[PDB]
Every structure is written in C-alpha cells, then in structure tokens.
Design a protein around this ligand. Sequence first.
Ligand SMILES: COc1ccc(S(=O)(=O)N(CC(C)C)C[C@@H](O)[C@H](Cc2ccccc2)NC(=O)O[C@H]2CCO[C@H]3OC[C@H](OC)[C@H]32)cc1
Ligand SMILES: [Cl-]
Ligand SMILES: [Cl-]
Ligand SMILES: [Cl-]
Ligand code: NA
Ligand code: NA
Lengths: 99, 99
Amino acid sequence: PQITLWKRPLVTIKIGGQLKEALLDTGADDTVIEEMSLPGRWKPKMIGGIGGFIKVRQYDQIIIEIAGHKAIGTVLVGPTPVNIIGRNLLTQIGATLNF
Amino acid sequence: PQITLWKRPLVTIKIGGQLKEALLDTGADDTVIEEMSLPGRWKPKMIGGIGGFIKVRQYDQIIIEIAGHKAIGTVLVGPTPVNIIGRNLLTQIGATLNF
Ligand SMILES: COc1ccc(S(=O)(=O)N(CC(C)C)C[C@@H](O)[C@H](Cc2ccccc2)NC(=O)O[C@H]2CCO[C@H]3OC[C@H](OC)[C@H]32)cc1
Ligand SMILES: [Cl-]
Ligand SMILES: [Cl-]
Ligand SMILES: [Cl-]
Ligand code: NA
Ligand code: NA
C-alpha cells in the first residue's frame, strides 16, 4: 500500500494471537510495545525518546504480523505511550519513504 | 527519492537561515527542532513521547526547506535530543510510506 501522512499511520498488528493497533514509525530505530506477556527470556535495554529514557524488556525472535505482513524480530516491551513499529521491522515488511 | 530504512532517514533542512540535519519521522505529529531563535510570535506548549514531556515554543507559519523541497507550517522549538520532521511538514512535501 501507499500510506499518506495526513493522519497517524496506524495499522493492525498481531502478536501473541492478539490484535493491537500500532504506529508505523520511521523515527524509531526499534519496535516498542505496551506491557504484555511474551514467551522466552528477555534482556535489558535503555531507550531514549523526546522526554528522557525508559527501561524496557528486549525479547528477540518474536513472531509479529504487521498490516498483514509477517515479521520475526526483536520487540521491546515497556511503558511506551503508543505501540511503535520501528525500522527493525519496517525493513522486514519492505517499507520505504517516498517523495 | 525512495528512502530505505536500513539506516535512520536523515536529511538536510534549512530553517531560520540555518542548515541542520533532521530525521524524517512518520511517528511524530509535529516538527520539533533543537533550541534556536526564530522570528515572530510564539506560545508555550507541552509535547510528550517516550520518557515523558518537554516544554517547547510553538512558532506558526515557518518556512522550512526539507531535502530541497519547501514547506510552511508550525515548528516547535525546545530540548529535543534530535531534530524531527513530523507529519505536519511531511505531508507538504508529498511523503508517503510504501510497502
Ligand atoms: C506532538 O509532536 C510530537 C510528539 C512526540 C514526538 S516523539 O519524538 O516523542 N515521537 C513520538 C513517538 C514516541 C510516538 C517520535 C518518535 O519517532 C521518536 C523520535 C525521536 C528520536 C530520537 C530521540 C528522540 C525522539 N523516536 C523515539 O522515541 O525513538 C526511541 C524509541 C525507539 O527506538 C529508539 O529510536 C530512536 C530513539 O533512540 C535514540 C529510541 C514527536 C513529535
Ligand atoms: Cl529485529
Ligand atoms: Cl502545521
Ligand atoms: Cl496527498
Ligand atoms: Na526470544
Ligand atoms: Na509566526
């Protein structure tokens, strides 16, 4: 698809068999999701945004569907205000910015 | 152009007579630039992201040149860790996300 930017680029994702809404975010290096349970072990990570830093849980090799495209990769879980799909998974679904 | 997302989508901008580097950011509603002077009136605003909120100055009707494309709109100035071109100006240069 071709998504214009007059509205937020929100899409449906599926993770852990649950549908959620998430933002397609070219300004995010990493994918960050609100608190939820994921399988496996996690590692610590610190991420920085506009207001300062937060601690998140890094889960690797998680299956996640994004706007109907399958991805398998790293998902950060933490107190993000919105679910964000960052460049690590935008590249897996083949997304580009065009103008 | 077509910008892939393997790396941060940074471009050169010109704002206030100054050249700067900024991130093309589909997850940002608004454009936020590190502290600089701009002419005209402004009013205070709070904007929030990962980490929490920062106070910024809102300047309206500011011209930016973004990777060689001119646009006009509101620019927020404050202690952002990076210069962000958000959707309010990405729309004006015709930027879309494609997959
Ligand atoms: C109302 O108008 C705005 C309100 C909020 C923002 S924002 O900057 O807070 N942000 C909104 C989303 C969080 C919903 C835009 C977002 O693209 C920022 C843009 C950004 C980028 C760098 C620093 C600050 C902000 N990215 C970000 O926070 O990235 C974090 C989490 C994802 O992994 C890392 O990627 C970069 C950063 O690691 C340095 C980590 C912008 C305009
Ligand atoms: Cl990944
Ligand atoms: Cl605007
Ligand atoms: Cl359009
Ligand atoms: Na894992
Ligand atoms: Na003005």
